């Protein structure tokens, strides 16, 4: 019985709390999306706009939690851009081996980072990110999938450093198990390719949903409350009316 524009009225404060805490670019994109919902003539329009803000906001809070830069989808590097810039000596072979799977070059993960060699972001340690993912999975039972490229049966070494990539997929959706299973299935082929190029990559995927206890998420609890008080209620009010 409530107009959608009126639904956005009741959740003014929840959504203002949300927009204030998200990263800037993330906050702006979410705000535009929110005015699209307020000015949504159809019920499919509103729901589809609400779904985008669920994904965009959560990713903003994933970046905040991990002190990574939030990247708008439009500015996200592809795999090929990462091979081109981080492993330029192997890019030509990366192209030849992707002839039969050209969509590999265009895979665009949520986070495409490299180890600080000192638009691919850099991080202090890939193994530290992998370990903290594995810890929470082991400690709280949170489903992850995790794949590391490895040429033949090579050992790690202590006398030389190599460049390396961390590829991370995240998300906020009900089927947590299905998300990580399909993510690591998408990226398996490129892990195998990376092994044949002698390129070290780790792929991580994880997922939260609204039933995950608030202390157990991949984002800070404070961020869990902001999502549940805003984007989650908006989904409940859209249905009821």
């Amino acid at each position, epitope marked *: 019985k409530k107009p959608i524009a009126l639904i956005c009225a009741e959740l003014y404060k929840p959504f203002q709390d949300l927009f204030a805490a998200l990263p800037k670019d993330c906050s702006e994109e979410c705000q535009t999306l929110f005015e699209d919902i307020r000015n949504s003539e159809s019920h499919a329009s509103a729901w589809s706009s609400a779904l985008r803000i669920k994904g965009v906001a959560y990713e903003g809070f994933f970046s905040l939690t991990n002190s990574w830069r939030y990247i708008p989808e439009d500015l996200k590097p592809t795999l090929g851009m990462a091979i081109q810039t981080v492993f330029p000596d192997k890019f030509e072979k990366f192209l030849e081996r992707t002839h039969l799977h050209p969509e590999y070059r265009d895979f665009t993960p949520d986070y495409l980072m490299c180890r600080s060699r000192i638009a691919v972001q850099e991080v202090s340690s890939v193994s530290a990110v992998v*370990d903290r993912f594995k810890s929470k999975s082991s400690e709280k039972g949170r489903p992850i999938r995790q794949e590391e490229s490895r040429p033949k049966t090579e*050992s*790690m*070494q*202590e*006398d*030389i450093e190599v460049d390396e990539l961390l590829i991370v997929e995240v998300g906020y959706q009900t089927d947590i198990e299905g998300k990580v299973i399909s993510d690591i299935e998408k990226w398996k082929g490129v892990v195998n390719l990376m092994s044949h190029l*002698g390129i070290k990559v780790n792929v991580l995927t994880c997922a939260d949903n609204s039933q995950t206890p608030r202390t157990d998420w991949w984002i800070d609890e404070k961020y869990v409350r902001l999502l549940l008080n805003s984007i989650s209620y908006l989904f409940k009010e859209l249905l009821e009316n």
Partner: antibody
Amino acid sequence: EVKLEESGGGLVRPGGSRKLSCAASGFTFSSYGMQWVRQAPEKGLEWVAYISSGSRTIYYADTVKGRFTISRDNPKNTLFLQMTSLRSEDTAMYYCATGYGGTWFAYWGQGTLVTVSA
Amino acid sequence: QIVLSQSPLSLPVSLGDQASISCRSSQSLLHSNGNTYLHWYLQKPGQSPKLLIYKVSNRFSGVPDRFSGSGSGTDFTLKISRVEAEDLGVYFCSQSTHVPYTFGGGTKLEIKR
């Protein structure tokens, strides 16, 4: 001078268990991977296990997988090998070793004898 | 599962002559990082092994310079330019490019008399 000193060898019944230690001195132990190598009497060398400086990466020879555990205590400059379900074929001199900068065996201990027999 | 094949099994050599010991690998030991982790050790009777050569041709610090190593890919050679009495023992090659790290079977250097 770099030195590695194994202890803990001795006699074990088949199926029994034994923990070896290796004390390291003369270098910054906590920055380097450490290894166990063994040699059965009158035979050649046989690699056993590797553990990275931060214990993040561990490798095992297939003949000890699921029976041996390699670990370390960096504040104590000590490398460990926990042996279980021991068999007569594990009778060997056990050496701990390190590359002090790589995965080769640059420094070796004097070794400690484990005899598995009833 | 790299298999390292040493030849000869035993090498009698006169004092002052050269010795040459071969180590063949079942696959290439070139690591993707560009290094080749093939190394050479000597075990004197009743002592623990000693490193001689690491990564094909790097003589370990303090090892006498009569010892040298060469090779690439799957074919490697340890040479003793002028054999001395203290060189009696069993020479091993070993690789650490792939897990498991593996050893050759040993070459027994014998002093000719």
